[PDB]
Short mmCIF file of C-alpha atoms in Angstrom, two decimals:
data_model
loop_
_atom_site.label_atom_id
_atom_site.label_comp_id
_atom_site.label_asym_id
_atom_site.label_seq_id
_atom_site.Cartn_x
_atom_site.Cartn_y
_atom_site.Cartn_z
CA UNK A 903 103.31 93.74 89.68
CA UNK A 904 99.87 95.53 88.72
CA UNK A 905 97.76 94.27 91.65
CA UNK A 906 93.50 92.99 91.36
CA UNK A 907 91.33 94.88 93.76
CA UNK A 908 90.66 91.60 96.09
CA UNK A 909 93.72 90.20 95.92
CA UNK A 910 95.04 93.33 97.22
CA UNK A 911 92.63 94.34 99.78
CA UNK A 912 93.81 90.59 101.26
CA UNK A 913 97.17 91.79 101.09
CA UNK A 914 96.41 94.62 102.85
CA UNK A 915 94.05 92.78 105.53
CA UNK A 916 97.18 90.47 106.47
CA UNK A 917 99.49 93.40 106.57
CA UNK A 918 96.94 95.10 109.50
CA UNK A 919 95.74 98.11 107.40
CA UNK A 920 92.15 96.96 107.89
CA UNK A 921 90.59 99.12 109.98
CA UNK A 922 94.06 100.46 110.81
CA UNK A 923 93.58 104.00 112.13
CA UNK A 924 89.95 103.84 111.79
CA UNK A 925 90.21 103.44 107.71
CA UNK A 926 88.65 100.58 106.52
CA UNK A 927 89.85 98.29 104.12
CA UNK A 928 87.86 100.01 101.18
CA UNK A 929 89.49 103.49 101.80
CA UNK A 930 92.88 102.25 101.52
CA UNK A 931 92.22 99.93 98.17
CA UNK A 932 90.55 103.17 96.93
CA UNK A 933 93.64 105.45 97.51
CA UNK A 934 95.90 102.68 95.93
CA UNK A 935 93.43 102.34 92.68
CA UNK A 936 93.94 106.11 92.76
CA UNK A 937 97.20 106.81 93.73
CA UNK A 938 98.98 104.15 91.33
CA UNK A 939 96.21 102.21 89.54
CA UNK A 940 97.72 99.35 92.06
CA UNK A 941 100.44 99.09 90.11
CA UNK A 942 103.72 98.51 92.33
CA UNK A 943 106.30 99.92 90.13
CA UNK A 944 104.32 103.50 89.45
CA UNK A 945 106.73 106.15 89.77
CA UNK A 946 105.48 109.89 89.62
CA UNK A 947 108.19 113.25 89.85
CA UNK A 948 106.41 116.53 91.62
CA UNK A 949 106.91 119.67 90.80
CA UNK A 950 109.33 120.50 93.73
CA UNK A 951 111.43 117.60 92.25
CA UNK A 952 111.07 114.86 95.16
CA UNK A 953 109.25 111.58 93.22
CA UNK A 954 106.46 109.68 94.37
CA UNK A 955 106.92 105.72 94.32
CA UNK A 956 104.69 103.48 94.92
CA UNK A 957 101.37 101.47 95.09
CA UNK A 958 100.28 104.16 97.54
CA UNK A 959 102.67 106.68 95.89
CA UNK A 960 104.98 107.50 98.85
CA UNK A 961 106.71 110.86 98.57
CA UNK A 962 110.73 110.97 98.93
CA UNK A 963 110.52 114.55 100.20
CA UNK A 964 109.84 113.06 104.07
CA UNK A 965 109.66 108.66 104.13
CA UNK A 966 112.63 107.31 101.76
CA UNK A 967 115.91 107.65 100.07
CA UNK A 968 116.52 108.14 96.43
CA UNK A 969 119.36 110.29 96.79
CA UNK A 970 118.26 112.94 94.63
CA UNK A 971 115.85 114.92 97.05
CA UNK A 972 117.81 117.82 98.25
CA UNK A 973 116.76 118.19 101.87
CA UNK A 974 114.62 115.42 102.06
CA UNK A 975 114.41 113.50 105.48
CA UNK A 976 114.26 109.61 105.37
CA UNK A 977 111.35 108.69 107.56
CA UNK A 978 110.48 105.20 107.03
CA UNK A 979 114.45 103.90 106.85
CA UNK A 980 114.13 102.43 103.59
CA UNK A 981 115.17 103.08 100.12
CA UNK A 982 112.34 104.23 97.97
CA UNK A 983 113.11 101.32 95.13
CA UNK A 984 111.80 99.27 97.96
CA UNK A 985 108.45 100.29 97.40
CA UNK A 986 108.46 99.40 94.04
CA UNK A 987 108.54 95.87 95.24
CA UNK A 988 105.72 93.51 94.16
CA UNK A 989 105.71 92.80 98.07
CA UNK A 990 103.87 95.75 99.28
CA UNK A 991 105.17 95.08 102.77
CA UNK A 992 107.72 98.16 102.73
CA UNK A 993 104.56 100.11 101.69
CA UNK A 994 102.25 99.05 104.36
CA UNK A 995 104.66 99.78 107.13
CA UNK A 996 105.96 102.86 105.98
CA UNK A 997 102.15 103.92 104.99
CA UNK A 998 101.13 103.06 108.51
CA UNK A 999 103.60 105.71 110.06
CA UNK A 1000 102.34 108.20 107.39
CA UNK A 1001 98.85 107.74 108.64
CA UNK A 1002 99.94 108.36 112.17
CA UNK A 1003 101.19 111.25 111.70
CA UNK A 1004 98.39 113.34 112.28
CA UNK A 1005 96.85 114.43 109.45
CA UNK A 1006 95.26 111.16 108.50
CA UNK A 1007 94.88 109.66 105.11
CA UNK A 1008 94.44 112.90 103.88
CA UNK A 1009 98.12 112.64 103.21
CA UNK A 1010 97.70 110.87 100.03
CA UNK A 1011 95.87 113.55 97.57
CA UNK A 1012 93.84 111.22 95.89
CA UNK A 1013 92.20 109.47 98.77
CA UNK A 1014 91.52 113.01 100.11
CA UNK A 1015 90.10 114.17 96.46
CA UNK A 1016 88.47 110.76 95.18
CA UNK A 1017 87.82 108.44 98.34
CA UNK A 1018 87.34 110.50 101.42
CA UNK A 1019 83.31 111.10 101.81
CA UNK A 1020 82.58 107.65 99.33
CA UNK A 1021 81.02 104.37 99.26
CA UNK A 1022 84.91 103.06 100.19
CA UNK A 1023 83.10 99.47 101.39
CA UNK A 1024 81.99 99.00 97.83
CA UNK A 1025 85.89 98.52 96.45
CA UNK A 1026 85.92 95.30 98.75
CA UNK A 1027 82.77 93.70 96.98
CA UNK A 1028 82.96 90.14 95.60
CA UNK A 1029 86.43 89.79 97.81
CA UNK A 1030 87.22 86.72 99.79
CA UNK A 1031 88.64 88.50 102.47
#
Protein backbone atom coordinates (compact mmCIF):
# COMPACT_ATOMS: atom_id res chain seq x y z
CA UNK A 1 0.00 0.00 0.00
CA UNK A 2 1.39 3.63 -0.93
CA UNK A 3 0.39 5.44 2.28
CA UNK A 4 -1.22 9.58 2.50
CA UNK A 5 0.82 11.75 4.78
CA UNK A 6 -2.14 11.99 7.56
CA UNK A 7 -3.33 8.84 7.36
CA UNK A 8 0.04 7.70 8.13
CA UNK A 9 1.22 10.02 10.70
CA UNK A 10 -2.20 8.44 12.58
CA UNK A 11 -0.79 5.21 11.99
CA UNK A 12 2.20 6.08 13.41
CA UNK A 13 0.58 8.10 16.49
CA UNK A 14 -1.35 4.74 17.48
CA UNK A 15 1.73 2.68 17.02
CA UNK A 16 3.63 5.17 19.88
CA UNK A 17 6.23 6.74 17.50
CA UNK A 18 4.90 10.19 18.40
CA UNK A 19 7.20 11.78 20.29
CA UNK A 20 8.89 8.39 20.68
CA UNK A 21 12.54 9.07 21.55
CA UNK A 22 12.08 12.69 21.50
CA UNK A 23 11.13 12.66 17.50
CA UNK A 24 8.03 14.05 16.82
CA UNK A 25 5.52 12.83 14.67
CA UNK A 26 6.66 15.14 11.68
CA UNK A 27 10.31 13.76 11.71
CA UNK A 28 9.29 10.31 11.34
CA UNK A 29 6.48 10.99 8.39
CA UNK A 30 9.40 13.00 6.86
CA UNK A 31 11.95 10.07 6.90
CA UNK A 32 9.16 7.70 5.54
CA UNK A 33 8.20 10.34 2.56
CA UNK A 34 11.96 10.13 2.10
CA UNK A 35 13.03 6.90 2.71
CA UNK A 36 10.19 5.05 0.56
CA UNK A 37 7.83 7.77 -0.74
CA UNK A 38 5.46 5.87 2.02
CA UNK A 39 5.14 3.27 -0.07
CA UNK A 40 5.11 -0.19 1.95
CA UNK A 41 6.39 -2.49 -0.61
CA UNK A 42 9.69 -0.19 -1.61
CA UNK A 43 12.52 -2.39 -1.83
CA UNK A 44 16.11 -0.82 -2.38
CA UNK A 45 19.66 -3.26 -2.80
CA UNK A 46 23.00 -1.33 -1.36
CA UNK A 47 26.03 -1.52 -2.62
CA UNK A 48 27.43 -4.05 -0.02
CA UNK A 49 24.52 -6.27 -1.26
CA UNK A 50 22.19 -6.33 2.01
CA UNK A 51 18.55 -4.66 0.66
CA UNK A 52 16.63 -2.13 2.27
CA UNK A 53 12.74 -2.90 2.71
CA UNK A 54 10.45 -0.91 3.77
CA UNK A 55 8.25 2.22 4.46
CA UNK A 56 11.17 3.36 6.60
CA UNK A 57 13.60 1.30 4.46
CA UNK A 58 14.99 -1.12 7.10
CA UNK A 59 18.39 -2.55 6.24
CA UNK A 60 18.84 -6.55 6.28
CA UNK A 61 22.54 -6.13 7.07
CA UNK A 62 21.56 -5.84 11.15
CA UNK A 63 17.20 -6.02 11.81
CA UNK A 64 15.77 -8.93 9.42
CA UNK A 65 16.10 -12.06 7.46
CA UNK A 66 16.13 -12.39 3.75
CA UNK A 67 18.50 -15.05 3.61
CA UNK A 68 20.75 -13.60 1.20
CA UNK A 69 22.86 -11.20 3.51
CA UNK A 70 26.04 -12.98 4.16
CA UNK A 71 26.82 -12.14 7.77
CA UNK A 72 23.96 -10.26 8.49
CA UNK A 73 22.52 -10.43 12.14
CA UNK A 74 18.65 -10.59 12.57
CA UNK A 75 17.83 -7.92 15.07
CA UNK A 76 14.25 -7.31 15.08
CA UNK A 77 13.23 -11.35 14.77
CA UNK A 78 11.31 -10.94 11.77
CA UNK A 79 11.54 -11.70 8.17
CA UNK A 80 12.17 -8.65 6.11
CA UNK A 81 8.97 -9.48 3.64
CA UNK A 82 7.23 -8.53 6.81
CA UNK A 83 7.92 -5.07 6.36
CA UNK A 84 6.57 -4.93 3.16
CA UNK A 85 3.26 -5.38 4.81
CA UNK A 86 0.58 -2.71 4.27
CA UNK A 87 0.42 -3.01 8.23
CA UNK A 88 3.36 -1.01 9.17
CA UNK A 89 3.28 -2.58 12.61
CA UNK A 90 6.50 -4.86 11.97
CA UNK A 91 8.05 -1.50 10.92
CA UNK A 92 7.21 0.54 13.88
CA UNK A 93 8.49 -1.97 16.33
CA UNK A 94 11.46 -2.93 14.69
CA UNK A 95 12.10 1.00 13.86
CA UNK A 96 11.66 1.72 17.52
CA UNK A 97 14.67 -0.61 18.52
CA UNK A 98 16.68 1.02 15.65
CA UNK A 99 16.13 4.36 17.20
CA UNK A 100 17.32 3.10 20.52
CA UNK A 101 20.20 2.13 19.58
CA UNK A 102 22.14 5.05 20.09
CA UNK A 103 22.71 6.85 17.25
CA UNK A 104 19.23 8.22 16.88
CA UNK A 105 17.26 8.70 13.75
CA UNK A 106 20.25 9.49 12.14
CA UNK A 107 20.17 5.85 11.23
CA UNK A 108 17.95 6.32 8.36
CA UNK A 109 20.12 8.53 5.71
CA UNK A 110 17.44 10.46 4.51
CA UNK A 111 15.99 11.76 7.71
CA UNK A 112 19.62 12.64 8.61
CA UNK A 113 20.16 14.39 4.96
CA UNK A 114 16.50 15.80 4.28
CA UNK A 115 14.59 16.06 7.76
CA UNK A 116 17.01 16.51 10.56
CA UNK A 117 17.37 20.54 11.18
CA UNK A 118 13.57 21.14 9.23
CA UNK A 119 10.20 22.42 9.72
CA UNK A 120 9.32 18.38 10.52
CA UNK A 121 5.81 19.81 12.32
CA UNK A 122 4.77 21.10 8.95
CA UNK A 123 4.40 17.28 7.36
CA UNK A 124 1.53 16.84 10.05
CA UNK A 125 -0.53 19.95 8.76
CA UNK A 126 -4.22 19.56 7.85
CA UNK A 127 -4.00 15.93 9.83
CA UNK A 128 -6.70 14.77 12.13
CA UNK A 129 -4.46 13.33 14.43
Amino acid sequence: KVFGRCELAAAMKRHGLDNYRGYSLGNWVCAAKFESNFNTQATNRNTDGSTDYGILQINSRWWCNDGRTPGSRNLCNIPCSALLSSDITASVNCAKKIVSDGNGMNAWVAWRNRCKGTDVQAWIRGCRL
